[PDB]
């Protein structure tokens, strides 16, 4: 059930022995070909499904060409054929209230999307060096982040300082140190402590939080 299209007569067999001769059959495994097989369930993008239900799911069988491409938590977009398989109603007798038509997708060519791959031209890569020549752009980025809230420029520079990230140089034959940065807030209520916490997730660059 992998040729994706033609429902051939299956071969309910693993390995044959003794073809029409008196020779003990030998098998060359270097010239025997293989392929892989991986199922993955896809939820619903839980913003455009309207509020009357929990997210649903279906599943998709892909092949070797785009395995290990799918980290759990990626805005993926697949395209394939729609396909049913399995005997519903005859393989057991009396068959009462048992669906026997599994939904499958035997597909191809996934793409990550963004709403890691952003190729830029010579133009924008030069302009970003051209504005790098200014000696103020650390301050402009602080004020151009949260377009709703006054002040807190000590907080505002900290977020962009944390989000971009500091390195950790691992010790050779020694324990590396902390190279992560971990900031904290506290405040009396309704003072925008949770405001700026939700919009770091929109520009997160594949950093999905709980």
């Amino acid at each position: 059930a992998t040729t994706t299209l033609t429902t051939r007569i299956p071969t309910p067999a693993i390995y044959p022995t003794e073809d029409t001769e008196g020779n003990k059959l030998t098998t060359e495994y270097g010239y025997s070909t293989f392929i892989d097989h991986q199922r993955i369930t896809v939820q619903e993008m839980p913003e455009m499904a309207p509020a009357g239900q929990l997210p649903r799911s279906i599943d998709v069988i892909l092949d070797d060409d785009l395995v290990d491409k799918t980290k759990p938590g990626d805005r993926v977009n697949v395209v394939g054929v729609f396909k049913s398989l399995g005997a519903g109603g005859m393989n057991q007798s009396n068959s009462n209230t048992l669906i026997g038509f599994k939904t499958l997708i035997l597909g191809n060519t996934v793409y990550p999307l963004h709403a890691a791959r952003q190729m830029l031209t010579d133009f924008d890569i030069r302009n970003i060096n051209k504005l790098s020549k200014k000696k103020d752009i650390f301050d402009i980025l602080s004020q151009s982040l949260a377009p709703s809230i006054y002040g807190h420029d000590h907080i505002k520079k900290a977020i962009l300082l944390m989000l971009m990230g500091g390195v950790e140089k691992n010790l050779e034959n020694g324990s590396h140190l902390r190279g992560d940065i971990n900031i904290l807030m506290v405040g009396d209520p309704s003072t925008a402590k949770s405001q700026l916490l939700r919009f770091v997730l929109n520009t997160a660059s594949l950093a999905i939080a709980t």
Partner: protein
């Protein structure tokens, strides 16, 4: 002890402060974002300097005076806080996109902790 920055958000009441607030929420019921996400994700692929004897000479002086002023005042600080004091300036040079740890980065690192502690 495993965290570094404990920002305590104030909510003090000043008649010019809240008046400025009142219109700015009102003006929004009706330098760009995708350039910003490119700039940081380009700056995760540039080299890391770590190396200038000038910048490391000034910060330890900057530590020692507050090392006299942490214990007789508000909050005791530890040796791992120095690993912040390299790390903020280390990322601050990553904003600069350069391979020389300058002097100017060490001034914003000290001044940011000074509001965080005082």
């Amino acid at each position: 002890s495993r965290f570094d920055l404990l920002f305590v958000v104030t909510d003090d009441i000043n008649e010019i402060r809240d008046r400025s607030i009142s219109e700015h929420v009102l003006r929004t019921h009706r330098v760009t974002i995708p350039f910003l996400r490119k700039y940081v994700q380009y700056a995760k692929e540039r080299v890391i300097p770590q190396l200038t004897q000038e910048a490391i000479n000034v910060i330890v002086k900057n530590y020692t005076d507050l090392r006299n002023d942490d214990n007789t005042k508000k909050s005791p600080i530890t040796a791992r806080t120095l690993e912040t004091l390299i790390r903020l300036a280390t990322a601050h040079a990553k904003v600069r996109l350069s391979k020389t740890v300058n002097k100017v980065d060490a001034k914003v690192a000290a001044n940011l902790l000074r509001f965080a502690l005082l």
